[PDB]
Amino acid sequence: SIELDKKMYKKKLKVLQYEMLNAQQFLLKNKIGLILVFEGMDAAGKGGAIKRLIERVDPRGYVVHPISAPQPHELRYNYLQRFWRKLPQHGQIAVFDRSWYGRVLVERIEGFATKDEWSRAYEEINNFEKILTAGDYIIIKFWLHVSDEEQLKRFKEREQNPYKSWKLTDEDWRNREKSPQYIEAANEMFEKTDKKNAPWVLVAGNDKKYARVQVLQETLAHIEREALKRGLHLTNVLD
Ligand SMILES: Cc1cn([C@H]2C[C@H](O)[C@@H](COP(=O)(O)O)O2)c(=O)[nH]c1=O
Numbered sequence: 001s002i003e004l005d006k007k008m009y010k011k012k013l014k015v016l017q018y019e020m021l022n023a024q025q026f027l028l029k030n031k032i033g034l035i036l037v038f039e040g041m042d043a044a045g046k047g048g049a050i051k052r053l054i055e056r057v058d059p060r061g062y063v064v065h066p067i068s069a070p071q072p073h074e075l076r077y078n079y080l081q082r083f084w085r086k087l088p089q090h091g092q093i094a095v096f097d098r099s100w101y102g103r104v105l106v107e108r109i110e111g112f113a114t115k116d117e118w119s120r121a122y123e124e125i126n127n128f129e130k131i132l133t134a135g136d137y138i139i140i141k142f143w144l145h146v147s148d149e150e151q152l153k154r155f156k157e158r159e160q161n162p163y164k165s166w167k168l169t170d171e172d173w174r175n176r177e178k179s180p181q182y183i184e185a186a187n188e189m190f191e192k193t194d195k196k197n198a199p200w201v202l203v204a205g206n207d208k209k210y211a212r213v214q215v216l217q218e219t220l221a222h223i224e225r226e227a228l229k230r231g232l233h234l235t236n237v238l239d
Contacts, residue, residue, distance in 0.1 A: 017057075020056065022237060033138070034137070037139070040144035042172055062088075070082060083096070144205040
């Protein structure tokens with residue numbers, strides 16, 4: 001595939017979003033749930049890619065969960081409990097903007113999880129996801145990669161953006177210094193939890209338009225593959 005100008009990007013995006021709406025109706029009709037994980041550094045473009053992914057999908061059929069730090073009430077349970085509570089029904093879509101993989105990313109880097117906790121978490125997470133995918137759930141995980149210089153450009157845009165500058169803090173700037181550790185943790189995560197039933201898709205995120213298109217294409221492709229594995233064929237169930 002090639003990069004496209006804005007008009008052709010818009011047309012390709014519109015077709016892919018129609019196909020995503022159709023795929024949602026297909027998964028609902030066949031009562032197969034869909035779980036999408038998004039991870040990546042601050043300003044990697046997770047939020048915008050999610051917005052394009054579900055923009056034309058029926059709002060009754062999905063929930064986007066913006067995941068932040070566990071609250072004190074959530075820490076009274078196992079770290080996966082707050083995520084168990086958010087799982088979609090069969091036939092519904094759940095999007096996790098950050099996810100249980102925080103156990104092996106920010107919580108590992110910041111020392112919130114002990115060494116034993118994050119060390120054993122890879123197989124705990126594999127086993128959890130396998131429970132779901134052996135039943136009636138499809139899981140895809142996306143890592144949006146962004147360069148340090150592109151992230152810096154986006155931080156400066158945010159600090160000049162009246163809708164976003166209130167949220168950018170000195171702590172975020174300082175956390176940019178921890179990026180090497182995050183990259184190492186993400187690479188170990190990829191090595192240990194990239195599974196056939198629950199793949200990691202690495203998304204080239206420096207160009208937002210390409211990232212949005214790729215997220216849509218990869219979601220649709222894995223839905224079609226998993227449909228085939230289940231003896232079903234994705235067709236147009238809209239018209
Ligand atoms: C998303 C997330 C953040 N955190 C921590 C990191 C920071 O100390 C704090 C706020 O992070 P945030 O500003 O990126 O949401 O919460 C966790 O411990 N676990 C998580 O899953």
